[PDB]
């Protein structure tokens, strides 16, 4: 089979996430949650990726050198990813990542 099944219906093993955004990053995609169709094995470090290829206004300030980015606060099932792994998590069906932009700690 094919690569690149990222829709419904199908095989595909897509799972859907409710991605909600905060502060700079919520007025940037003009919501504060929606829900995103991603790969099952695609966790919070791809979902990011792939977010700043659609919104211009979370371009570089989502992704620091392969991580997620210093002082951003980013969250996974309500539990702030920064303090474990932020690429890669846990991400399954029916999950919340929320997101606030980088905070200044200084």
Do not use: C
């Not at 659609?54 to 392969?66: N, S």
Request: glycine share 14%; hydrophobic share 35%.
């Amino acid at each position: 089979g094919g690569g690149r099944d990222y829709k419904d219906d199908d095989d595909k093993g897509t799972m859907e996430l409710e991605l909600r955004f905060f502060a700079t990053f919520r007025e940037v995609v003009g919501q504060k949650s929606i829900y995103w169709r991603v790969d099952d094995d695609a966790t919070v470090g791809d979902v990011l990726r792939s977010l700043e290829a659609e919104y211009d206004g979370l371009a570089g300030r989502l992704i620091e050198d392969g991580e997620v980015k210093p002082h951003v606060n980013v969250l996974k099932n309500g539990r702030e990813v920064v303090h474990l792994d932020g690429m890669a998590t846990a991400l399954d069906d029916g999950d919340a990542v929320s997101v606030f932009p980088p905070v200044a700690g200084g």
